[PDB]
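Entry, Tuesday afternoon. Goal for today is a structural model of the target with zinc ion bound, before we commit to ordering more compound. Inputs were pasted exactly as handed over by J.K., no edits. I checked the ligand SMILES twice against the vendor sheet because last time a stereocentre got dropped in transcription.
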Amino acid sequence: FAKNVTLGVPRLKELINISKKPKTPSLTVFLLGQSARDAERA
Amino acid sequence: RDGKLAKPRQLHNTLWGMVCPAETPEGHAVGLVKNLALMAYISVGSQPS
Amino acid sequence: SLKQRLKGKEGRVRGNLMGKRVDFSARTVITPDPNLSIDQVGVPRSIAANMTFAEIVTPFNIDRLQELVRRGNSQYPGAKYIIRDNGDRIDLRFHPKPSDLHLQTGYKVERHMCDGDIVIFNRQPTLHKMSMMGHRVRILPWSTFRLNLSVTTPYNADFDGDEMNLHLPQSLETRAEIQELAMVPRMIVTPQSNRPVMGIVQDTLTAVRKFTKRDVFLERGEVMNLLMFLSTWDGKVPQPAILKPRPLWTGKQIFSLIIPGHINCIRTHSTHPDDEDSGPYKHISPGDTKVVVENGELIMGILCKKSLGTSAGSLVHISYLEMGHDITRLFYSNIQTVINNWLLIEGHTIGIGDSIADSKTYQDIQNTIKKAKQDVIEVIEKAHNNELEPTPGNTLRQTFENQVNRILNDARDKTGSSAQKSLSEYNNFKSMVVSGAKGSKINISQVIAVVGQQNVEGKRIPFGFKHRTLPHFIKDDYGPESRGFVENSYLAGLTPTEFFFHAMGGREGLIDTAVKTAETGYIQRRLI
Amino acid sequence: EITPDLWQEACWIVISSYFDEKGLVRQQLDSFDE
Amino acid sequence: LSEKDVDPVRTTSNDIVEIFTVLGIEAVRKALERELYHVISFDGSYVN
Amino acid sequence: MIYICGECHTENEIKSRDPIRCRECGYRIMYKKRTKRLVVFDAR
Amino acid sequence: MNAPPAFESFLLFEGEKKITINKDTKVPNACLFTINKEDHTLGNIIKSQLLKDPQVLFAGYKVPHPLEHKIIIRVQTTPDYSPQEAFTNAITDLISELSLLEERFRVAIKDKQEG
Amino acid sequence: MIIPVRCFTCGKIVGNKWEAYLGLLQAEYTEGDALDALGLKRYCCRRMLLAHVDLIEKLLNYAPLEK
Amino acid sequence: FIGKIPIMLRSTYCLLNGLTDRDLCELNECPLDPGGYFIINGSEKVLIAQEKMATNTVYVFAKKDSKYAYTGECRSCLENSSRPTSTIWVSMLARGGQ
Amino acid sequence: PYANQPTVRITELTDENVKFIIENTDLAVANSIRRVFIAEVPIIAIDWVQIDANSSVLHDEFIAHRLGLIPLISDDIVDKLQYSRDCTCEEFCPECSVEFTLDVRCNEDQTRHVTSRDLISNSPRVIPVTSDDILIVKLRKGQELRLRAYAKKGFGKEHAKWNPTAGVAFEYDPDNALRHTVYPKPEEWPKSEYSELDEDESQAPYDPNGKPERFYYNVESCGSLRPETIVLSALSGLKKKLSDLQTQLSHEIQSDV
Amino acid sequence: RKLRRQMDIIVSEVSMIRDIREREIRIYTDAGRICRPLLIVEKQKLLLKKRHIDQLKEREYNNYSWQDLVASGVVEYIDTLEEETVMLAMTPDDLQEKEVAYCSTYTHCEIHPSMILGVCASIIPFPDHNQSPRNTYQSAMGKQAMGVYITNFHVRMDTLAHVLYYPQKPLVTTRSMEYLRFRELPAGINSIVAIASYTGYNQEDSVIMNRSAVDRGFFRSVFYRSYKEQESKKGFDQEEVFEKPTRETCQGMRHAIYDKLDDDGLIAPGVRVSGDDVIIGKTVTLPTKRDCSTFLRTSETGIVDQVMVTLNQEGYKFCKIRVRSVRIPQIGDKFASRHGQKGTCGIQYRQEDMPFTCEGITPDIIINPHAIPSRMTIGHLIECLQGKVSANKGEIGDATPFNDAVNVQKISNLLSDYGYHLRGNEVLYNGFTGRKITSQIFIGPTYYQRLKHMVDDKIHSRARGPIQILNRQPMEGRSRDGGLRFGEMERDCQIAHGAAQFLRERLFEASDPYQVHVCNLCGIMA
RNA sequence: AAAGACCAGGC
Ligand SMILES: [Mg+2]
Ligand SMILES: [Zn+2]
Ligand SMILES: [Zn+2]
Ligand SMILES: [Zn+2]
Ligand SMILES: [Zn+2]
């Protein structure tokens, strides 16, 4: 330290240990059709 | 001192005039060892009769 | 128990097999020495007298080693022990021992460490392999290790109570191996980030910046004095840039002699605006920024951390890649010596006058701070009467805090820009920042204009007391002063509440530095 | 009967009186006395 | 990923275990490289 | 062997393997009476 | 314990020569003067007195390391004029200058006192 | 402890100027005027007397090891 | 006689209590010495104040992963007359069904 | 290729100060003459200290250090006196050293000031600058101090106790006309004592052809050597060093050729 | 509140709290609560009036002290959880008087804001102009500053007693340092400090000291070390005794010199002792004799200051010996300002070599300007300016943290009133060539303190010395002539080099080598 | 004195 993701040493530790439960597991999503451009379908 | 909890070590608003903010040892004991302010006085105790 | 003996740190395996205490190792305080070479390390006489390197007597060196034996252990350039063929060890410290001073080929004589010896130099928060490099011994008076300041960066050392280990290889095989693998010139460029690790840093960098400008002009005697500190100088004095009415050389002209061989490199000075490359004067550079080094000659530009520093494509990186480690070592040393000896002429400093702006600038900064306070008060009042709409994904408190933080950050950035715009070309803070030796623009902003918002755990100063930061403030006060925004600057001095809030802010950095190191070290050990 | 613009003298006078009366280790001395 | 109108090629997550269970081991290799690169170069540093 | 006292500062004669007891003072602390052999100090 | 004796900036112990001349092979008729146990007081003095000579092309002094007491003076002259002769002439020039200055200062002090 | 002779920066004798400085301070003069009357024009000299503290008086309170 | 108690220097029961500067100098003691330390086997020992939670008051804390959603505790001691402390917890069983 | 002719005028000359201006000379020679004032001027100061009894609250080498810094009048006999290293005799002899004897015991209750007056020398020429009194140590009742000291001949290179001078004020180009230093704001810099320009203007106009000359001096003696003897012996010592260098150079040239 | 103010039933220590929103009233008489005094405000005016200050000015011979001030209902001891319910004013002359309305219900006013600092942080001049981490560093470093720690040090014989020759009270001081008794026992000395890059030997955090000043006693100190010894009877016929052993009467004997010992085996004070010298002659009667004498630590080369003999608790003969060694600041010693500007001594130039002002002033310490811009010590520059103005004016500068009456502009104008540049800059001449330095150097007297950390006590060298009893590896520590440790990270770094046999030497040959005979059929030693 | 613990401190 509004998406918040662990960075720095704790994130490196999580990646190295492959923690089964990361502190802030996030999943970015991309849209194929008109929902990508139009805000209502998004 | 080995504890990685960074919360107790932090300088609190509650320490104003009570404990010196700047003065503290360096190393594993940062914040966990505090030296008294100039005007700070410790209550000695009294019977509440 | 036996299991406790065979355990982790201080156990048998980790504490006596993977790592162990070694003979032939010395440690003392380090001290800067610009007059030493890059690969050279200053060694006190007592350490060299105690430290011994075993040498095998041959008909080539029988006379010199016999002389060293005759000197004994009293005089420094001597030997402490003699080892015969059968392995019996002879001590020259006790009594003259006249019958045993005879030397014949095949014996081992343990002479004291001398100049040119090969040693491993270590400072041991060893993160990467450059934290331990082989050095060349030069004996100096007094009692501290001395090493060149470009070598400072790989070791991460600073000359304040720092201590470094000195390991002396005891065999010819390991000595040659350290010479051909771990020497300081051989490790200028890292495999970690394919950049040079050593770079012209601090005093020599600032003086390079002040010496590379068009403004500098050097007379005859100053040119001679600078030229003799160039070790690779061919002995031909270059024709001065100005011949009439009087012969005046230029800083770039003399610096071009330092650049080895025929090095071609193009860089940009930190001051370089982005408008120059688009419009005219692209190759003329009215501010003399950008860098062009053609045929090993500095044609134009100002040198800074972007050119001589530790960065990809830097001038020193090009020197290492095109020429080689040996010549780049001399390039480093010549830069250091000649530039320090020119700063002996020009001089550098920092003072109170360097940390104050014009009265108009102070008035502008005060007006900006007042406007910021008015805007944040208006935002607080608007949130109070519920006109503040919540930004999606954020609660009303989150949006209010975001608005306040944006206002305060914009105010601080504007004040910093105004303060940096007010610095004269002679200002020493600006001279240090543009050179990249030390400091930054935010540092000048904090010194001159505004310290800025103080944050604890990434948020504005919390309510340690009951809905108030300090007893001096009213309850539920979200204003900039109450929540930790420091209006004053370091030059002006912080108010007591601002002083306490700044103490809280610095406590965060102190705790992070003290607490992250253990976990980082554990991560490094696991990876290794 | 007030102290305007003379505060710098008065505050340090009362601080000096405090430190002459109590000292620096007064907390230790009082704790052991109790 | 199974959901309609969600791009199946570019959608990804920062955690590694579910990538291992869903997309395989080479996808884990690539995603772990991406996560390490992000956490290293976020501050602006560069590692070869 | 002469020791000078820490309270009354009157020199007393006492050999080894005898208890430390200052005469006419009642003190238990003795001192060594700086030696007679002379050392050279430079003025630097 | 490693502090050198105070008398190592002026005292010459056994073995070292006060001055040493080594010719410079990089350029013609240029020599290298090495003065042992001596510092800027005369390094600068011969450096500046050499520059007065129109027949000297290069002239200077340097200290290889402040912790050591040594001066390296490099002199390059015009052909048919040895740098050793220039260095000797500069030293004699400085001797004459100092003698004249001492005489003038004695005259000035005699004028100032009861005058 | 005691007033150091030979002011560190330049070398001017100030070991003899302590008692006179104390007298001038005790009778009329302020520190600036007392230092001026002692002929200390360079502030490196004036810092020697002005910032000096004389523990030699405190050390003399204790009884000598020998009477 | 049941034992000897070390005496903090310059306290009320110390022999240096109430002595003037000259009296302290006659005792080869520094008048500026604040005291407040014990002399144990010749060495000078100073007791450092130790922090601890205030006793006999009610506190409420919330743990992130405990089975308790909100936990109230009272570290209780009786006039410091006897026993170190007897502490009691009153908590709420989160949300997961029992 | 020959000497420029220097001229000297003496502005102020007292028993503790001499103020002179050196003209028509080079910058390096002025600087070297300034440095010889501090470094190369011979002087007599206490070096060898032996203490018989030291009851003072100051330990032995503390009072020895204080004794060594005591200035001694060497206006005349410093030249005839030889360095102890070059002296034929072992240890010290009157032709290489001066003996000082100190003997003070405090009997009265009031504190006794052991001063430079209490130092007793065998020869009357070297008095510790007492024709107030330099304080060595203070003694309470019952304390005693007896020591024997030898004073040697040395110069400022060896130790600062052999510095014959106080702060030597050197200055050239008072109104900055050579632009050796550039004032970022010339108007806020105080004008020097030797400044020759009017009050309204700040710096003299830049002189491209100028070279440093008219080097203003201010030599303040520490009381050991009277201030004019300091500069005279400085010039003599610099000339002697140059002559010795000349002799060694000539020998080297004959040897190598 | 009235009863506590007049101290009839409730002592001033007891704390009373009213939590209005939660309807609780808490009265605490417990021990261990932390409290500080605060002035009492009634309406918008202090209860501290002119008469209280008038009576406190005459505090001597008046029997009117702090206790009578507290008993008058003027000052009150407010602890923390009562401070929660209090509303404080920073200063009375600013926050009590009518202005743009912020608060009108002030109940207490702070004595002085500088009282929030501790003992070590109070000596910092202008601490509000510094970066807080640097204030922390200076606070933790002032405990290591060297000076006269106590006035009776001559009679106390304790190990590692560091004493400075000429401590000075700072030119720029805080009002609290008077109450810290720092004036009477200073730790450090003011020094003319030039912030410049002269020869590059002060780069990083290093400093350049003036060799002439150091020779004049600048930062010169003394180092006392105490040696205790206990003669005792342990065995039936086994006993210990102080005496000077002869060449052949004892079985154990070291090649150290014993001739300095007296008849009782104790060296009288005034005898110079170097490394390996025997301090106390002590032997053990073996059930002929065994020498257990104590030697000096290696290469101290000191002079025996004091030797005291007495009886211990058991009545056995007991000896303590103190040896002093005067240590001149070398180019390895550690020096710091009062702002966390720590650093080692780069090199010591004589007065000739150091740059000089037009008045002949040569800085005693030159620090690199590169330290200042990054770590934010502006109070260092302000302290330097204030020292420069105070040494000229003749006053001792006032550096109370929160004055608001001492601006940088005010100090600048005061300095300009004395013929110097208003910003403290001074034109400097090169020490070597005599040429004017093009930049104008910032010069002024700044308080500097010598630190305990000194190179002579830190330098170590090892070459085949003592080995451990169990691992047969080099010992641990400098005092035991132990070898340096080649830790795990060291071998990993060497593996990165691909330096196989250098690692083999470091971990097998330089350290413990050994040979074992192992069977060929079984893999076990034979 | 030996290894054990504790403490303080430097980077
Ligand atoms: Mg460091
Ligand atoms: Zn007695
Ligand atoms: Zn002075
Ligand atoms: Zn003789
Ligand atoms: Zn077998």
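Chain B touches chain K through 26 residues (CB under 8 Å).
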